[PDB]
């Protein structure tokens, strides 16, 4: 809420590159919760892969969702209707890997 439907934080923070991006809260099945700063229109696949890849998980075994909403590879927070600090849960796609 700035005037209408925006957050008025960009004119304070933004020391990284282009002001600031948006961070999601990833909930892993190991209860690991990681904060990812992706751009509004960033492939949430990348988000999914970052978690899985570094933590040693196969992408076919894990699904990332926004409040139970299945994230697709070419789907981004912008498209799904999320913003900074939104939450994404990890659930099992197929058999464990």
């Amino acid at each position: 809420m700035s005037d209408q439907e925006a957050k008025p934080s960009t004119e304070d923070l933004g020391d990284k590159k282009e002001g600031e991006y948006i961070k999601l809260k990833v909930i892993g099945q190991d209860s690991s919760e990681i904060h990812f700063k992706v751009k509004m229109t960033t492939h949430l696949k990348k988000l999914k892969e970052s978690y899985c890849q570094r933590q040693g998980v196969p992408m076919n075994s894990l699904r990332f969702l926004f409040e139970g909403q299945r994230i697709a590879d070419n789907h981004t927070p912008k498209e799904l209707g999320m913003e900074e600090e939104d939450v994404i849960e990890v659930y099992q796609e197929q058999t464990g890997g």
Binding site: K17, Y21, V26, G28, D30, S31, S32, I34, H35, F36, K37, V38, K39, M40, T41, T42, H43, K46, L47, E49, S50, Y51, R54, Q55, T76
Partner: peptide, 20 residues
């Protein structure tokens, strides 16, 4: 007067580089 205490940290995953 305040002192810092070390915390225990679980899984730390890194983030990728931004799109858009």
């Amino acid at each position: 007067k305040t002192s810092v205490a070390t915390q225990c940290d679980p899984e730390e995953i890194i983030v990728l580089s931004d799109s858009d």
